[PDB]
A paper describes a structure:
Transcription activator-like (TAL) effectors specifically bind to double stranded (ds) DNA through a central domain of tandem repeats. Each TAL effector (TALE) repeat comprises 33–35 amino acids and recognizes one specific DNA base through a highly variable residue at a fixed position in the repeat. The crystal structures of TAL effector (TALE) proteins bound to their respective target DNAs have revealed that the residue at position 13 is the only one directly involved in DNA base recognition, whereas the 12th residue stabilizes the proper loop conformation. dHax3, an engineered TALE protein, proved to be a useful scaffold for structural characterizations. We then present fifteen crystal structures of engineered dHax3 variants in complex with target DNA molecules, which elucidate the structural basis for the recognition of bases adenine (A) and guanine (G) by reported or uncharacterized TALE codes.
In addition, given the resemblance between Asn and Gln, we generated one more dHax3 variant where the base recognition residue of repeat 7 was replaced by Gln. We then attempted to co-crystallize these proteins with a modified dHax3 box element whose 7th base is changed from A to G. Four complex structures were determined at high resolutions. Notably, the newly determined structures reported in this manuscript show that His34 forms H-bond with base G, but not with base A, which consolidates the genetic observation that His34 is a strong and specific code for base G. The structures also suggest that Gln34 and Asn34 are both strong codes for base G. Gln34, highly specific for base G, was not reported before and should be further exploited. His34/Gln34 → G and Asp34 → C can be used as strong codes.
Residue numbers in the entry: 231 to 723
The structure:
DNA sequence: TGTCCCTTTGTCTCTCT
DNA sequence: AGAGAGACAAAGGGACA
């Protein structure tokens, strides 16, 4: 018989119990732990169900699932209950920071290494705890911490990088590989091809940073003479997760796409310059003629859809959903293209298909409004949040549907909507801002942190901004959000 | 296998102006 | 408002004990 049978059975026996107190996990959360943390992780969560939930740690189930759903999850769980007090008392980290460090493959290694190396990293190397946490919060975080300790001096001194740059390089999966490749390849890339340190840092600062740097070195000559690419265009392609794959695919498919479809190299670069660019290119080669047939989508529209992260997913989803969204939902092809032309286009298309009739019939929005909500990165999240929160925001908080749609119609719209529902009362009743001002602050990208920064300043006033009135602070917060307040917070110093 | 580390792709959020 | 950064997640492969 199949050997995985006993184990699968054990998985299900134990999984059944976890639906009960004190954790109560759903099928989705249980699948997740099983898929990545495996069987021993599911058994571990059960074994330490009580010791984590409340006294004296007090971890939410969502947090227990986050620690458990990785390779070694069992080990991370044991280590968290051991090291979270140590790290919150002896180094002053928050439980959230400890959880974030724990929530990656080999989390036990990262936590123990942070416990070991944080003092030497802050004292002898002048890093902040936040920076130590960031470095540590990726797979192989133990390796990245140890490589930062060893290579920070030689990277700042012999190679001219700032600590911030070293931290940025180190704070991805395979950070150790990226750091080491930069030490070796920075003079080669700078002095042989005229790249700035900053361009090299940008290449190095993604997962697979090492792969992308080595690929830039190899392919930069062939890309710049033969295919007529600018060093600037090559750097942009390489400056993305899986840069190596995007680069190699650009060399392959640039002439093919240009000659056979009439795309410019500028358009090709834009398709290639996201995470999964490789996938976006190969999909365009296949799918463009299919999308463009019968006077359907123009090439230019296919390029736009292609030119975002997961462009492959967006392209395929349009091919599937263009007819059913146009015909049965009364959308123009142009509107479908608008919704698809953002990171997560696939998610957003699917969510419009599912929710357009609900939001229209049940909540009284127009299609135009639904499209406007959908037509940003994270459009799925914003649509789901408008569905959840429109009744409370309008009925309990006074807002018009028009104001809710405005808040929702930017990247982070979900975050903006949730924060408004959360902070509207204290902003208006405790400090006298008008609802229209709160809406105004929140109706920009970065709505959430702009609102948080404002609430911070009115509940624990920094003298640095006391010279500003509430209205001035509002105008500032609408002008440039949290960064503008923060800058002002300094300009005064 | 269980654990650790590395790489790619997809999605979401905030910044920079 | 569009490009850039970066953060978080899901999933697969190498390595090894």
């Amino acid at each position: 018989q199949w050997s995985g049978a006993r184990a699968l059975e054990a998985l299900l026996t134990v999984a059944g119990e976890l639906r009960g107190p004190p954790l109560q996990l759903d099928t989705g959360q249980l699948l997740k732990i099983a898929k990545r943390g495996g069987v021993t992780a599911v058994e571990a969560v059960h074994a330490w169900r009580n010791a984590l939930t409340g006294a004296p740690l007090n971890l939410t189930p969502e947090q227990v699932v986050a620690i458990a759903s990785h390779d070694g999850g069992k080990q991370a769980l044991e280590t968290v209950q051991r090291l979270l007090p140590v790290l919150c008392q002896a180094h002053g980290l928050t439980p959230q920071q400890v959880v974030a460090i724990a929530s990656h493959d080999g989390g036990k290694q990262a936590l123990e290494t942070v416990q070991r190396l944080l003092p030497v990293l802050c004292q002898a190397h002048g890093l902040t705890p936040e920076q130590v946490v960031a470095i540590a919060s990726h797979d192989g975080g133990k390796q990245a911490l140890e490589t930062v300790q060893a290579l920070l001096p030689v990277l700042c001194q012999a190679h001219g990088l700032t600590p911030e740059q070293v931290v940025a390089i180190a704070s991805n999966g395979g950070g150790k590989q990226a750091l080491e490749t930069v030490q070796r390849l920075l003079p080669v890339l700078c002095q042989a091809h005229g790249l700035t340190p900053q361009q090299v840092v940008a290449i190095a600062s993604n997962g697979g940073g090492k792969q992308a740097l080595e690929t830039v070195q190899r392919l930069l000559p062939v890309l710049c003479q033969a295919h007529g690419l600018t060093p600037q265009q090559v750097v942009a392609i390489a400056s993305n997760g899986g840069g190596k794959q995007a680069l190699e695919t650009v060399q392959r498919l640039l002439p093919v796409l240009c000659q056979a479809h009439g795309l410019t190299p500028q358009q090709v670069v834009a398709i290639a310059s996201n995470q999964g660019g490789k996938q976006a290119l190969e999909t365009v080669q296949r799918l463009l003629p299919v999308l463009c047939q019968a006077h359907g989508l123009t090439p230019q529209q296919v390029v736009a859809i292609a030119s975002n992260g997961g462009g492959k997913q967006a392209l395929e989803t349009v091919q599937r959903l263009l007819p059913v969204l146009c015909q049965a939902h009364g959308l123009t092809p142009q509107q479908v293209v608008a919704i698809a032309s953002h990171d997560g286009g696939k998610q957003a298309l699917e969510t419009v298909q599912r929710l357009l009739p609900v939001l229209c019939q049940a909540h009284g929005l127009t299609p135009e409004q639904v499209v406007a909500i959908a037509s940003n990165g994270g459009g799925k999240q914003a649509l789901e949040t408008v569905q959840r929160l429109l009744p409370v925001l309008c009925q309990a908080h006074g807002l018009t549907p028009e104001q809710v749609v405005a808040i929702a119609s930017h990247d982070g719209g979900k975050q903006a909507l949730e924060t408004v529902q959360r902070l509207l009362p204290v902003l208006c009743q405790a400090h006298g801002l008008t609802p229209q001002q709160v809406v105004a602050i929140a109706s920009n990208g970065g709505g959430r942190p702009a609102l948080e920064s404002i609430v911070a300043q009115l509940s624990r006033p920094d003298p640095a901004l006391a010279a500003l009135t509430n209205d001035h602070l509002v105008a500032l917060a609408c002008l440039g959000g949290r960064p503008a307040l923060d800058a002002v917070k300094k300009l005064e110093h």
